[PDB]
Amino acid sequence: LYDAEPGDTIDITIDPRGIDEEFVIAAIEYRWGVDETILTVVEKRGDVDD
Amino acid sequence: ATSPEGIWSNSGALTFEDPADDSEILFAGVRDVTITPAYEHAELYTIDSTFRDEVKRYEHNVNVEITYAKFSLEFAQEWLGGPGATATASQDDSDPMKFNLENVTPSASGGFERTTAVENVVFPELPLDSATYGEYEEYSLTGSGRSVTNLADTSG
Amino acid sequence: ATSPEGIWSNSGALTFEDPADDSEILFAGVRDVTITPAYEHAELYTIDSTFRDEVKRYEHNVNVEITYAKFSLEFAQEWLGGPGATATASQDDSDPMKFNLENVTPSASGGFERTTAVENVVFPELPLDSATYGEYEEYSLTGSGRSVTNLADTSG
Amino acid sequence: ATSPEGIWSNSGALTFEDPADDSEILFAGVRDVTITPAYEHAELYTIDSTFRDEVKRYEHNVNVEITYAKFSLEFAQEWLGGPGATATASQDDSDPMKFNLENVTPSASGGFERTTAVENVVFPELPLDSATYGEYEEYSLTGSGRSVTNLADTSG
Amino acid sequence: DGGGGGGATIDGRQISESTGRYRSDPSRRRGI
Amino acid sequence: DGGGGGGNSSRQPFAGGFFGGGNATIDGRQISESTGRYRSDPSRR
Amino acid sequence: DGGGGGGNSSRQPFAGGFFGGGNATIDGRQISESTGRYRSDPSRR
Amino acid sequence: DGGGGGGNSSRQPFAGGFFGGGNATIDGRQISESTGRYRSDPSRR
Amino acid sequence: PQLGDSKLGESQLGSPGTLKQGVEWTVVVDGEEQNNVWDVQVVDTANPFGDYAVFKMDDRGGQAFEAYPRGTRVEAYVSEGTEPLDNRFTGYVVERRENE
Amino acid sequence: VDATLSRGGTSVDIPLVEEGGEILLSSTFGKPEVNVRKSGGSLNPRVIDSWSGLQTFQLVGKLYDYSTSHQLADLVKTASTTPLELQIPQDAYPDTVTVAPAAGQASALTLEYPAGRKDLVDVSLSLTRVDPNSVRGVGDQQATTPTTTGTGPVEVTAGGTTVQLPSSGLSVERTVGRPNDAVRRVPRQADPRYEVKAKVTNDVFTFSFETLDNIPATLNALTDNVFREQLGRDGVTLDFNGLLGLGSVKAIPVGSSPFRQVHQAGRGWVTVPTLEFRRIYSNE
Amino acid sequence: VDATLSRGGTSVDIPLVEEGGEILLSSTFGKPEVNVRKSGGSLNPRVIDSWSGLQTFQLVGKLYDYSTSHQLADLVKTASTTPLELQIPQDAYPDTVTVAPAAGQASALTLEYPAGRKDLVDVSLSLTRVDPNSVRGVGDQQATTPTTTGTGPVEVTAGGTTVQLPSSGLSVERTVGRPNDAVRRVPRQADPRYEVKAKVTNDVFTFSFETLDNIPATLNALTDNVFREQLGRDGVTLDFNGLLGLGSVKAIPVGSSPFRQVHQAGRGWVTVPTLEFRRIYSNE
Amino acid sequence: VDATLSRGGTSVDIPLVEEGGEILLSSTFGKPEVNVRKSGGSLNPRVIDSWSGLQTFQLVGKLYDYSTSHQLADLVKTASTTPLELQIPQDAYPDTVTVAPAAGQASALTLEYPAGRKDLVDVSLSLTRVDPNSVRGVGDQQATTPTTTGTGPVEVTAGGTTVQLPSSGLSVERTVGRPNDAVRRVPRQADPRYEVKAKVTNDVFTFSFETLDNIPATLNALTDNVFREQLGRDGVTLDFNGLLGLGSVKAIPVGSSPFRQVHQAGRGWVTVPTLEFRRIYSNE
């Protein structure tokens, strides 16, 4: 998903999480090394920075 | 079936062949010959029972041991040379010379002629010199064949 | 090839040589001599069979063992001295004396003359004194050669 | 060099000395004597080859074993006492009595007089009583010296 | 029978200090 | 039996050394999570 | 001591491995506390 | 060969246990850093 | 082989090489590739939150630390398999840090 | 007599036979969920036992055909909410216990196909006891070991190049496990709850052999194409060509020591103590 | 011959004796508190040694009665500011050293009462040297081992139900330690400071036996009432009925493997390699 | 016969010989940097291989000269950006490989000078393969081993007091390594990058011996002056006095178990299994 950006939409299916859905991407994080693309979906919230 | 019968050791005729040719390797003057097909037996036992449940064969070989009193330069140089070659010196290579072996014996009152044949006999060590004061040199081989290729009555 | 033939122990002539010179080291009065080239055998099996798949030679050795009844100061002092030297006392060094060895034996009916030669025989221990009441001193050497350098008919 | 020659066991003359004095320790009635300098041999092989590449000496000792039939109170009380002392009872200390050993033997027809000398021979165990019905008591020592100090023709 | 006989403590200060670089970061990414 | 004597009472403490779980603490308090999940001895191979 | 060829040569690295206690770093800096408490090896059993 | 064999039979799982180095997770996510530095087994001693 | 390394007809054209596989990120600093990089993290996010990237590389004698003054341009390009390089992040340095 | 492991209509009998006096069945019992207090002012600690306990079964036995061995591997690896029932042929145990493959373990099952033996397979199982009414889940994934009737050499294929493993000294060890299932404590059942997950399993093939001929060509063909190249998202195609009845599997070497070349003093050949491949995603 | 271990009026002599050539005394010296720098621009690190060192003793010996063994256990487990003095019968050591049980260990002392060996107890002790003037604390807690004169079987009682452990192959190992004491570095002297704590100790009984008759009944009575029930804050009553002169204690099994039932090929009975109980809150 | 290890003009030949059938050369291949996914909804994991692999060599052999043994120690310990080149005398390997001392190890090289065994040194090397074009660093640090022509006893000096180690049963083991170098993964390339650091190395001397006479005086002189004193920034001075050709070195004992006294049943003397010193800062 290097072509993907925030505000784009994507199909996600996860069993046993029970979701089979189309979501807006609120953020993407790419890791090399562990080679993970991390999608934040629907909305993003902070923590102590909020 | 054929009646069991005595066998007289001195009636035996042992021969060695190169498996590349089926050509005879000169060998003579044996005194003792023992050939013994063998397997490892796993003797399996179960829970609770003290009795053996099953027994299984694995890891077959044929133990061959021969004592002989006439030295053969051909046999010794074939052993040194390894497969399909002959040498006057030790060879620094990993292939042992494999001999096909056959022994033939009449039974003691002519009931049968037992032929035993063994494939790919190899010998870990070869006695070259075996001198003892006041004795003819006596040479003992120990080795292992892959399988018995024939055990039959070869009489007419 | 040459017919196999009996070999008479007392017909043998054993000799030792310094590998630095090819000079003879005086040795005599043998009673027993055994020379046995050997390898370890790796009998290798396979995934789905009880039969042997392949067999391979490794770790070559020539077992030399000699029983003899005439003492040699030269042989004993060569052994003490290590390679290329003689000594009258133990030497505190890590190089053993290496002997070249040759044994020559006629066949019992003169059919061939068998020469066996062995390189770099070493003896882990040297018997100096071997006294037994009412007997001549008799000495046993056990040692290991690197390889057989020659095994041939040396007759004309 | 001197021609090899037979050695008659009964021609031998064994002696023991205290290394603190060079004084003789009374010992007699020998039946057997074996003296054998030895080393551990590290027998070394390479990656590529089935042949031995090298052989090296390490831990040196001289094996001494003696069978004898005349009991000595001095030799026994020296052994009990440890170095430079003599005792009638076992001593609870870690120092073994060290004996200098020498044996002298003419060759069987006078070619040489072989002298063997060994430093710091120690015996792990001393047979005090060795009685068998209808026999004289007979004693066997096994021990280890540090080195051969002398092996020479000591004839005139 | 002789054969038979032959039968983390973690410093709260140093975590709190070493993580400081990173705890403050989201707020820096957002200015203040 | 000669090899088995050394072997068995080696294979036993192999499990004793290998199977010990982590138990980290900050300032006297446990920080390892008390996840109620089991683990049991691996296949003998 | 009689089976020590497999025994002693194993008993020693069992102790050596057991004293391989935990240590940890964040970003090059140590986070293991310098609690000056000793451990000494347990009973041989 | 009971000593030498039992030794080699032990040396392999000693190495296997030694490569069993630490890894850690908070709430299912790894906290161990993906530092791309290699380790390889030490001299045999 | 490389040009002039082999005589004509002796060896087949592309050897010893083969088609690219795996994921590669290249970091570009004022138009120059940094070549000791061993990890990359890129974050792209909706407007209440900042986009950012973190790059990790080896250095010697501070020679690479000198390449990244505050405000220096950085670009991170990604390629997977044989696909073309894609400019996935562009920004400016806000912190350079070197530590043991 | 014999031990049965079964799930609905699928069943395997595991002989529970061994040489001499080896351990056939070790069952362990434990309280992993007791809270023994680490401190407090008394000489001995206060305690609380308040949860289900552990019971483990370790079964050692032999199988007399490869087909049954593959059925056992598939039976263990499968994700299903249908209870896996073990029947133990010893009076100290009930006629059936419900089990999971060992609770957190990558190696719940081991199958060894040693060199020099035919129609013998060494089996080692580790199983955790679980409550029969408390097998829970949603997903369902039948595992299948590929099978074929050939007898070609084992072949490792990568980068368009195929390497035949030597027959000489060839030995196969296969391990199987379900480390992503959860076995969980329950307040006042005796046995724990079992959460079956349609998630990644462990399935590993280990080979040992000795390369006797064409040694550089054989070892270098393997190491060049498998170890020194990057394999991307794909991996080795490991094909048994019908040895042990096995077919073709996609796999990869994993970790610091999946392959080793060993050279011994005085031996004119090379030993491979391990060549180890984990099976990868190809169940599409 | 004997080492003497004593605390005020209480004293125990331990024969430093063992078979053949076994280790009787191992003394280990170390510097846990040297700082060797992990990096820096030198070829060889800078260092700083600035604290008390470590000295440890392992004593192996034998005791000739059970009464002395219980005295030794009570002496080692007891909390008191009264210095525990060790006298070593060997010239490489001073006439007395002040000691703590092994500094952080659950098993400072082990006592083994093996099958066959009447009136022999194997002792293994581990002790840390401490500064004689630097034994510090507030609370005294005299430990006690309960004793009785009976000859009955070892009994495990839980849920009103009693199991008798088989006499056949019965061996006892007891281990004792004080892991909650602190042995601490001090800057100016050779030996560390010892902080004696009136806090929880370790005290464990391990049984080993072979179950020969009434095998389901015996093992099921143990596993049902101890391992499958929840024990609450009470536990097993473990009663020696006067074997080794021991009485009765409250105890519990702890952790993943405190009990194992082992079945061997060709044997008509069950081995129990271990059955472990930790002593729990009891004193008043 | 020999393997050759070299650094520009400096070169050492290591015979690669051993007794009987011992391992001379192990080469291990691996993929430390594959990402096998721990979870996901497949039966078998998705994977990605995207980085350089690992290749390691363990070499075992003997040296016939102490001088060469010191050259080998200096060669391994030295920091230089000049490639360290290994030549292996077996046809599977290329004629040269570039290497680092084992990537993260305190013990990359071990030299054993056992009792007996005049002019024999056991060598064990662990080496990691690295890319020949990818050796990087600031600058060199030539390591050296002090040498002298004497024959005196090994002397340990601290607090102005010198202690001679017994000759009886004496063995020396020296270990050397470069744990502060970095061997790093690279994309799209076979072998890792090597970062040579002008930083702290590992260099340790271990002694084993038996004290036979003046036992309290010898062991107390060692323990009082080395172990029971605080040494400060300065080390012990360890002087070989020309044994093995070695000179004088500043060093310190480190950690929990650097020294042991062992007493065995029925023996009138003390064994020292290990006395272990790490070489400290001493370069100007």
Residue numbers in the entry:
A (entry chain BF): 303 to 352
B (entry chain B4), C (entry chain B5), D (entry chain B6): 2 to 157
E (entry chain QF): 294 to 300, 317 to 341
F (entry chain QE), G (entry chain QG), H (entry chain QI): 294 to 338
I (entry chain BF): 2 to 101
J (entry chain BB), K (entry chain BA), L (entry chain BC): 2 to 285
From the paper:
Here, we present the near-atomic resolution structure of Haloferax tailed virus 1 (HFTV1), an archaeal virus thriving in extreme salinity. Through single-particle analysis, we obtained near-atomic resolution maps of DNA-filled and empty virions, enabling us to assemble full atomic models of the virus pre- and post-DNA release, including all structural protein components. The full atomic structure revealed that the virus has a length of 1350 Å and an icosahedral head with a diameter of ~600 Å. The tail has a length of 560 Å and terminates into a baseplate with three radiating TFs of ~190 Å in length.
(A) Full structure of the tail consisting of a dodecameric head-tail connector (HTC), a hexameric tail completion protein (TCP), 11 tail tube (TTP) hexamers, a trimeric baseplate-tail connector (BTC), a trimeric baseplate hub (BPH), and three trimeric tail fibers (TFs). The tail region begins with dodecameric gp26 [head-tail connector (HTC)], which interacts with the PP to maintain a conduit through which DNA can pass. This is followed by hexameric gp29 [tail completion protein (TCP)], and subsequently, 11 copies of hexameric gp35 [tail tube protein (TTP)] making up the bulk of the tail. Each hexameric segment of the tail is rotationally offset from the next by 23.6°. The tail forms a hollow tunnel of 36 Å in diameter. In the DNA-filled virus, this tunnel houses gp40 (TMP), a hexameric coiled-coil structure with alternating C-terminal conformations. The TMP extends from the central channel of the first TTP near the portal to a cavity in gp44 [baseplate hub (BPH)]. The coiled-coil region of the TMP precisely aligns with the 11 tail tube rings, confirming that its length dictates tail tube length. In addition, we observe two densities between the DNA and the TMP, located within the TCP and HTC proteins. Because of its location between the TMP and DNA, we name this protein the TMP-DNA spacer (TDS). The TMP and dsDNA are separated by a spacer (TDS), and the dsDNA traverses through the portal into the capsid.
